[PDB]
Design a protein around this ligand. Structure first.
Ligand code: HEM
Length: 153
């Protein structure tokens, strides 16, 4: 469970992200696909992209980045009381998109790195630890739903 002070750190930096949701979404998905190329292969929508320049030129990738970060921001602003938001996301990620929990660990690392590059004065070590706790809680609660449905591994 995060404390109130840890939530304030998370949401203080997230309010900065929301000034440029689309740029953050591009940076995060690009980092995920470059650092873990097995993730790109899960997207029939993006697996034609073969260079970082092609990724940065894709308007559809930039649109989906906004879809992903809008869904994460709605979860973070619930401060843990996010059951209604995780149900459909776990259901689609486990049963339709076939995304292992481990790949949610990878996108979490990408989100932390991009928040650190873009917001250093609001993403010191205290806020890095609190965001890592928030992203752990997201993964823990999704993994419980995966396990229900037979997909934890
Ligand atoms: C912070 C973690 C993530 C969030 C909030 C998120 C959010 C979303 C949302 C809101 C959608 C569209 C609605 C739906 O299908 O449920 C979606 C689609 C999808 N996501 Fe994620 N997702 C995350 C992580 C990942 C990861 C790590 C992967 C793959 C490595 C992935 C693969 C997919 C795929 C393949 C689609 C369908 C794209 C399409 O063809 O339209 N997701 N995601």
């Amino acid at each position: 469970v995060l404390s109130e002070g840890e939530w304030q750190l998370v949401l203080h930096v997230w309010a900065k992200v929301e000034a440029d949701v689309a740029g953050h979404g591009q940076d995060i998905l690009i980092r995920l696909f470059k650092s873990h190329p097995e993730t790109l292969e899960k997207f029939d929508r993006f697996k034609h992209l073969k260079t970082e320049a092609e990724m940065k030129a894709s308007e559809d990738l930039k649109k989906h980045g906004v879809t992903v970060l809008t869904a994460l921001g709605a979860i973070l602003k619930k401060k843990g009381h996010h059951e209604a938001e995780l149900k459909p996301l776990a259901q689609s990620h486990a049963t339709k998109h076939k995304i292992p929990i481990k790949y949610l660990e990878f996108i979490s690392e990408a989100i932390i790195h991009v928040l650190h590059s873009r917001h250093p004065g609001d993403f010191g070590a205290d806020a890095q630890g609190a965001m890592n706790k928030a992203l752990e809680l997201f993964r823990k609660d999704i993994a419980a739903k995966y396990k229900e449905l037979g997909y934890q591994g």
